Amino acid sequence: TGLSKEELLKVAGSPGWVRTRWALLLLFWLGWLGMLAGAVVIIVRAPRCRELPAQKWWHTGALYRIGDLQAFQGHGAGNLAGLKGRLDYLSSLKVKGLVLGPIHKNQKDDVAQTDLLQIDPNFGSKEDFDSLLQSAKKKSIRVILDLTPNYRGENSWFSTQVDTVATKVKDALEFWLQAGVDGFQVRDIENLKDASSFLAEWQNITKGFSEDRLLIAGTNSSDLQQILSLLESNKDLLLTSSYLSDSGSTGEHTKSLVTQYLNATGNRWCSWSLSQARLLTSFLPAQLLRLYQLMLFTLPGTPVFSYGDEIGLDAAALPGQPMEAPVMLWDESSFPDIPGAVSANMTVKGQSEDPGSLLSLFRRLSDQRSKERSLLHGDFHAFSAGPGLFSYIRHWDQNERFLVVLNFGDVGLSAGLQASDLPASASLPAKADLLLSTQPGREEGSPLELERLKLEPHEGLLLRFPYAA
Amino acid sequence: VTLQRNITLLNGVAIIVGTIIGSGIFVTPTGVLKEAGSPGLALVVWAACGVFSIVGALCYAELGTTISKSGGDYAYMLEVYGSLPAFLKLWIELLIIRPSSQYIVALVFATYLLKPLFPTCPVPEEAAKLVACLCVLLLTAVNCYSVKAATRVQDAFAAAKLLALALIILLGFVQIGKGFEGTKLDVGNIVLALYSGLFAYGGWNYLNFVTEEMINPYRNLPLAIIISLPIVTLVYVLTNLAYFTTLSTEQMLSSEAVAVDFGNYHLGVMSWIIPVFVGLSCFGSVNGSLFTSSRLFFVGSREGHLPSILSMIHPQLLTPVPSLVFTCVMTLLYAFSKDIFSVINFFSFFNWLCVALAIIGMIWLRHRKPELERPIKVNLALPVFFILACLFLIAVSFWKTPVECGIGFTIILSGLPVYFFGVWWKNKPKWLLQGIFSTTVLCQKLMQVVPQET
Amino acid sequence: EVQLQQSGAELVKPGASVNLSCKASGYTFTNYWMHWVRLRPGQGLEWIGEIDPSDSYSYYSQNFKGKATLTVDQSSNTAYLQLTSLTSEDSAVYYCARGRQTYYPWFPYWGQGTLVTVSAAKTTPPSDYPLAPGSAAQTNSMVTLGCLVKGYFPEPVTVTWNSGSLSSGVHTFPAVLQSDLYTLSSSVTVPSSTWPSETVTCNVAHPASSTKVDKKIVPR
Amino acid sequence: DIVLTQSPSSLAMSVGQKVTMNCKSSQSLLNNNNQKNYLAWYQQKPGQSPKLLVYFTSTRESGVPDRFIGSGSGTDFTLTISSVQAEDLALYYCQQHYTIPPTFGGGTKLEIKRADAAPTVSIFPPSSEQLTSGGASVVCFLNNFYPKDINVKWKIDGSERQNGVLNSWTDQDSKDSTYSMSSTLTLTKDEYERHNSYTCEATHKTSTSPIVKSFNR
């Protein structure tokens, strides 16, 4: 239904149509070269990516400390081959680490009968130790070993001839690195003479072996200045401390203890922890435990928990047991010495089922901290969001941005966030997706109006929100 | 003036392996695993979709050597179901299937090609749309200048992507040499694993659009099918094996671009090669689809369903220039879509329903008109198995998604207005006929095109 | 001692802004946040917002967001509430209040309130007219004396008798508003021995136009 | 926000008696974690600032008489006064402090009941200074009566006057629990000139006959 070959060539071969056809050909082809130049302009004018920082394993989420292998298990099973069994739990916690409270052969207060190299036979054999350590490698749980020498005694470095004790450690670190451990914790460095110098030597020995091993020192200190002094000469030492411990016991000081410390250290890496050893519940009253798990999982740095923090274990709740090493409550059998005292909700089995439980919050947060590039190594901006609220935004370059809102005071807010004076790079949205709340009865997943939000007393929120160029 | 036959066996295999291998094995390995839950079932739906494709494709070799028209599914439907069914089939492919699938693999080309300028952030949306359009435009122009260009381009990039997939499989083999199934099993969910997997096999039917352009159809159509789809199935299960040796389930479920993570892990400072080859793999498919899509519309115009200009050919080059220019422009309209990857559900529904109808037709025509020649005949079981399988996949996915499938049927039924107006009811004021003719000859004058002869 | 105090009265032409101010004393000013509460007549207390003097952060009720603006001046222990876009229905008393605990809202210490009137009518100093009984005055043992206050504006005028010395047996009647000017009267009763023998004055005083007047109650 | 209904809006009671305010909150103000109830009571005497009485539902503030006992939990709260004194007439507001911003009750006006008493009535001829203005205001004071209900007739050369009369009652006096009332009649000077004898007469429920005072200019 048109011109034949004959009819077309008798018309469309005219010089006017030839010039028109040439024009349309070159118009199209310069149009495509124009659209290429347009795209090459956009690709140069576009904001370049921000260099992603090379991160050691301990940046990627929580360590986990096991101060007594016996207390973590119940007796008889209290040995390293027992512990090899439990790693599936730890893998459930998404803990990127472990720290086995000292296993070396220490005789109480005896400098000479103590060895930091031979393991105390109660816990097994080096053949067990390696069996564990190899299993943990297989399951992506690095293992640190705690080498604080006189750990069965009163003073953990002994009272005397400290240079011989330092010499024991200097030898020990080499041996156990050769055995394959992922680094070392030492404790009580306030009871060690010339502490900063020995940390410098031991740190050099560790990093000198491999770049992906760490030394966690730990102090009973809560003085900002003493802490900053141990951290002056040593720059990639985690130093766990009592510094966040003195919280005011309705959280009231925390916005300030946290943001001073970040400011003072110059936003280096940190280890957030309420102590060098004892549980969260040694310090926090139980209305805050949820609120601190939301915070320890989302400040810049590697959080550290003792065992059973994830279930809000408490030494006082099952009377008589020592505040050093309370028996871990796996199921209702786990403390048979006063049977029927353990409620279901106090135990791992009893929490594991319930989305509202503490361990269901720990598990969930541990996920976010270990996957999300924003919590993994984002920047941090505190801001004044509200009267009680410790509030801050974690952000990376262009990834998802996370606003954390902790209501530390005992009075609910009824009038929204009202952020004064946000950094211009990090401005709050009109709305943001509630990724979780510390409290039940919230529409998790849904977007919230920040100017008309309502926190309850001690309700923390984790909101997630997308980028804007 | 009519199109010269010049597709060899090798260029036909390059059309199928080139047009299938495509994007699916780079952009969708996550998609099956999110529905299948575990490597044990995920790596199985990759084989299962292979099998369903193989029996469907062989079924297309029977149907194709039977009828031997070009225009594939549409042609074979017209010979069985008649005018209105065949028009609705083609109206769905004119509006949504072949435009959207072209724009989908073009966006993937642009995204993965630009990704080494933007590692660890979103690649700039507007530059990824431009470079998607630059791809479609250049391959339309190549496809208009010479079929001996566009088939050599198909060979070139069919080779390139198999080299890239060889590297990925090889690094898998290296890793497992150096040195399980927690599954959300639900008939209401595994179906969306299959619908995700089958998108990566989409294209076995594409050589059936160029049967009137191969040099020896009765040999090379059924040979190119059965050489091709076993190669594709093998490459796909070995490539998935490679991904699952390198990555955890949680990585593959949460990462944006599986092949990039695989590249990063194995190649470090040299990792940019894997993104670029995923790009070049998509580019090959844009070509293969522009090739086979333009020929569909050319046939639909020849056999009276589609306005006459699209049947015409540029006589100095023998390329179907108004059809290519249409399928091109119709592709670029998909740039005005935000969440375009949504359309893969509509694509998956609409495509296998049309293949179902075609193979119902294969049995029906072999019973109803048994005198027609069968240069290859295979079995009566493979059609029946494929029909009950595809009708299961359709019925069950419909049952799980009535809200989406309902609006889907309005796309189908949107054809009846245009069908009656253009084909059958034919409102015909003589000024309208004068206008359509005047517009047609104007298009002839611009593009210098002549209608098809004998 | 803890003591907040405030200006007594403000007049505002509708639509204009106003500054109301509250000077603390008797405590470390930055340790405690400062709150502003309002009392619309016969309609119950309403809280506007509070401010932290330590950094000028402030938090506001939904009704006041953008309508109010709190600031503070640590050099003088003063807190200030700006209010804006005032209508007639924002006429009220505005009270400055301090917390017990650091920001928690229950209010042991309040400043005496600032009465904010929103009206176009002009400031008008009072006219004072003393009242004495006239006929048969001394026929009774106790005698009443009075002080009309007429045609004044705005609302807050104060009367005390003999500079607050006669603080026993004084009645001052609430003001009546007429043709956009107020009228008020005050009364006192004294022994019949006292009044012709001694000074008696209504010490009328008006915060919003600074006039202080001591009319003596002289017999006819 | 929380909403606090309060009732009754008035609570007239006699000196020495026990009295009860009710406060009723649209949510619970028990803090589960701590087992105390966040509520306060403020007294506001007429012409003064709010004074805090009790908070956390029961804890008396320093400088508070021990006759204020606060109690309740959940949402039903009551402030009680063991033995009302004359000094206690006031508005009482309840306030939540379970959230910031806080919110308050619309408040209960406590009133005192006493033995009824007839007004001392006095009338004051216009001020000789006021007569310069072209106007004059005649004033009648009714002092120290109970209860509040009263009415006033103005007579002018015997004619009853009902244009240009104004009245103001005081709040009840905290020393003696009596009301007082001022009545005012405003005239032009020429309106005060043309008439000779001015009368204020007051009817109060303590007397069948009105009380009368008058003057002749």
Ligand SMILES: *[C@@H]1O[C@H](CO)[C@@H](O)[C@H](O)[C@H]1NC(C)=O
């Ligand atoms: C400690 O290690 C640093 C390199 O990290 C090196 O410069 C220094 O000399 C070392 N010192 C000792 C005593 O090992």
Ligand SMILES: *[C@@H]1O[C@H](CO)[C@@H](O)[C@H](O)[C@H]1NC(C)=O
């Ligand atoms: C920390 O150790 C020092 C030195 O033995 C001791 O004086 C101090 O009281 C300790 N503090 C705590 C709270 O353990």
Ligand SMILES: *[C@@H]1O[C@H](CO)[C@@H](O)[C@H](O)[C@H]1NC(C)=O
């Ligand atoms: C702490 O933060 C303040 C914020 O104004 C800053 O000026 C100061 O330099 C920071 N560092 C120290 C050590 O005070």
Ligand SMILES: *[C@@H]1O[C@H](CO)[C@@H](O)[C@H](O)[C@H]1NC(C)=O
């Ligand atoms: C657990 O349940 C017991 C028994 O109902 C209850 O008394 C207790 O408050 C609950 N919480 C914890 C952590 O003990």
Ligand SMILES: N[C@]1(C(=O)O)C[C@@H]2CC[C@H]1C2
């Ligand atoms: N084979 C495809 C692929 O990329 O995998 C699927 C769609 C049809 C042609 C392309 C797009």
